[PDB]
Design a protein around this motif. Sequence first.
Motif, short mmCIF file in Angstrom:
data_model
loop_
_atom_site.label_atom_id
_atom_site.label_comp_id
_atom_site.label_asym_id
_atom_site.label_seq_id
_atom_site.Cartn_x
_atom_site.Cartn_y
_atom_site.Cartn_z
N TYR A 27 1.03 -1.27 -0.02
CA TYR A 27 -0.02 -0.12 -0.12
C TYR A 27 1.03 1.31 -0.09
CZ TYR A 27 -3.58 3.41 1.05
OH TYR A 27 -4.42 4.49 1.05
N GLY A 80 -6.13 9.31 -2.47
CA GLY A 80 -7.33 9.67 -1.56
C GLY A 80 -6.74 10.75 -0.42
N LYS A 81 -7.72 11.49 0.20
CA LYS A 81 -7.68 12.78 0.81
C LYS A 81 -6.80 12.32 2.14
CE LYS A 81 -11.73 15.15 -0.84
NZ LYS A 81 -13.12 15.87 -0.37
N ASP A 82 -6.56 11.33 2.65
CA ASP A 82 -5.57 10.92 3.87
C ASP A 82 -4.19 11.35 3.31
OD1 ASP A 82 -7.40 10.33 5.81
OD2 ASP A 82 -7.79 8.32 5.21
O1 LIG Z 1 -10.49 10.20 -0.47
S1 LIG Z 1 -11.49 9.66 0.19
O2 LIG Z 1 -11.58 10.67 1.42
O3 LIG Z 1 -12.81 9.87 -0.22
C1 LIG Z 1 -10.86 8.24 0.96
C2 LIG Z 1 -10.02 8.17 2.18
O4 LIG Z 1 -9.10 9.25 2.12
C3 LIG Z 1 -9.12 6.87 1.94
N1 LIG Z 1 -8.07 6.75 3.07
C4 LIG Z 1 -7.98 5.36 3.38
C5 LIG Z 1 -8.97 4.85 4.47
C6 LIG Z 1 -8.78 3.43 5.22
C7 LIG Z 1 -7.17 3.35 5.61
C8 LIG Z 1 -6.05 3.93 4.33
C9 LIG Z 1 -6.48 5.18 3.75
#
Ligand SMILES: O=S(=O)(O)C[C@H](O)CNC1CCCCC1
Lengths: 482, 315, 6
Positions: free
Chosen positions: A54, A452-454
Amino acid sequence: FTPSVYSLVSKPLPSNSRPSATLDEQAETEDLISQLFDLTADPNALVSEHGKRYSGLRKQEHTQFLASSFFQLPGKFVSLDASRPWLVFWTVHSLDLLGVALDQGTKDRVVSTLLHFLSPKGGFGGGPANSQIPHLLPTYASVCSLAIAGNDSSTGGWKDLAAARQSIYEFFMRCKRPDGGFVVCEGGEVDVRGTYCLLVVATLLDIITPELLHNVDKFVSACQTYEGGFACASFPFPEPSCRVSMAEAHGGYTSCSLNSHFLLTSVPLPSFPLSIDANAALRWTVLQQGEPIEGGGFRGRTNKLVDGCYSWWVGGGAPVAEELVRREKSRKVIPPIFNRVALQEFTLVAAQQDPGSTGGLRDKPGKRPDQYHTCNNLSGLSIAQHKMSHSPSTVSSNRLKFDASKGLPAVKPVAPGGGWKNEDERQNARREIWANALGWIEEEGGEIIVGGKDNRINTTTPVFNILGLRLKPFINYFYCQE
Amino acid sequence: TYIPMSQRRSWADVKPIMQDDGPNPVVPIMYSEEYKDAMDYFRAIAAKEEKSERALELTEIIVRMNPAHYTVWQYRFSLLTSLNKSLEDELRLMNEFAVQNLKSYQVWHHRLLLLDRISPQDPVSEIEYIHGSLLPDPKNYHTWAYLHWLYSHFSTLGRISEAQWGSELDWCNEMLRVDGRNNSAWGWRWYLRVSRPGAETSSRSLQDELIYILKSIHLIPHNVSAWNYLRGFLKHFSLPLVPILPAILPYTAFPMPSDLPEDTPLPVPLALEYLADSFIEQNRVDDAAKVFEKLSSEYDQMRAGYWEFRRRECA
Amino acid sequence: TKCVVM
Ligand SMILES: O=S(=O)(O)C[C@H](O)CNC1CCCCC1
Ligand SMILES: CC(C)=CCC/C(C)=C/CC/C(C)=C/CONC(=O)CP(=O)(O)O
Ligand SMILES: O=S(=O)(O)C[C@H](O)CNC1CCCCC1
Ligand SMILES: [Zn+2]
């Protein structure tokens, strides 16, 4: 217009049937990066292959890496004993980008440590003032670190910087060479790193004068090579008959030169700054983005290797060159200019330390993470994530709110006529410099967060490389615009 | 077994000064006993501004432990000049020092200051050393920058003869023969042939230069260094792109391409950049736009956005 | 082969 590395065909740089040492190293690096990309899940995919790594930004690992480096360093760090303010800056700026706060006690320690590096005669050194002489580069690093960790209280350190304005200015003038270059320290080397670090500090602290800036623009302009980037320095042939660039276009020196030139464009002097070839600098900038096989990271020079730190040096220079290009076209009379997606992919997949280890970010696979690469990988990642523009309407708005009746005492020039002609000129200069310094904005709807936002980090400012939320209160303090 | 300087008879009169970090410093380095002791005594030496042989020795001890210690290097050069020391002896000591510390700004600057002060009537020996020093790393940036300074500084004094310039181009030619992808040597060629004040500019010297560049491209068609050099050359001398186009057209699918070498996939992105810019030169803006779009769509997709920008520039 | 900026 920003294709993922995983969506493109990965091919080695062709040999043309002529092997060389350059190609040997390139092919080796291509293998190394592509192998790690092959083992890693595509950050853009909802469904990942089972067993694949990941790529998510391991923020807590990077925080712990910076923590360990922060309170005690092993004996081998002696090689960086003259760079201790850089170690501070790389740590505190990275923590800002990672969104991790220091408590007040730790902030106070940062401020106190840096204040011990300040000489009464002027400037910061790489260590305590009883051990090391002042140097332009630690002066930049210390000043920015004070912007990040300090405040306006009696223990906040900004008070001490304000008092040191005249002495810092005098140190800057002692460094000044007639051709427009500056020595980095007494008896030291002359290059654009010195110019960059000096101009940043002089801008932030309201210590810019005409005598400080004479020929400074000309020295920088003549650093531009036939490749379009900038070399370390230019040589003045005996005011000089001509100026000639001294080595290759490099990401480090191109970053410093573009940023220097940009800072000079807000100074209201006649026929100043001497122009650079902005289109060529943009061309050089974009050409340094690596191929899909090498992860889309930036290299620092033609036919050398991609390296995570150039995400800041080359990538962070892109918005600057873009703005200069925009102004040049306006003077006669939109997709991203580099692959913002690929650069993030390099950062997440290739530049992070392997998971479950020491943390930190690095040059490339096979290289140990360090504070320098942690800071510059993240600073570059920020530029890729957040669409940065220099906004004329924001500058205009800044001009409208500026209070010229508020400010710290004018600097006393070395030469009797080295200051601004009068108070109108001086106040107009202060307004332009302050207003443009606060002209960088993040364009709403321009955000691209790969994976993704994280993975999102905070927004660094082009040219200065500190967060806007640090820059604004800091420069407002010294210009008394709070 | 380390003998502390507080037990050495030669240092008995000296009271060491401790590092002034203040209370609880951030980023502290856990120094070796040797380094702390040396710096404790250097602080005392620098404070009293002692210019002596023992001080000179101490600076060497320190820069060996930390070759990046700019303060100590500054103090060392100050001692050398003050004591009227043999600068040639120091330069010889730096020969070993520089090889082991290629990326040290201060080692390379120390060499520069020494050469500047010695100011030899003929710097040939230093030129030769510098060439030799490039064996372990032919791309060491500080070395190339230093070589540029050496020739520029000594040419200003009128100390670089035509024979010297000639053999320097010969050496540069050899460097590019050994590795044609060495961008540092391409940069040096530009200084030697184009940028230096004493460089010859005639219609015939331009001809020779074009031949060299084109030959280099034909030998390594995917070599970005050679392409950048060509583009800089034509731009600098305001030379039209069109007349050279025949030598470049084959890569878009005076010396001409091979009757093509193995491992040369077509098209070469920078050959298409040349073709598009040649269309621009001809006012053919639609023909340039199509080439830019193709670079954006298919042939150089990493730069998709930049080529799109360049396409919109035509429209 | 570290990176050096100072
Ligand atoms: O981009 S979004 O906010 O729609 C989705 C969110 O950021 C995804 N982050 C994942 C969550 C699960 C652990 C690994 C990181
Ligand atoms: C203090 C500041 C703002 C410095 C500029 C930052 C950089 C990255 C400067 C580069 C200095 C340089 C050219 C060093 C030479 O050694 N480095 C390399 O060879 C690295 P590469 O192979 O990527 O050129
Ligand atoms: O988020 S990071 O990738 O920086 C590292 C973070 O410590 C992951 N560790 C989890 C925490 C929960 C149980 C044990 C495993
Ligand atoms: Zn690096």
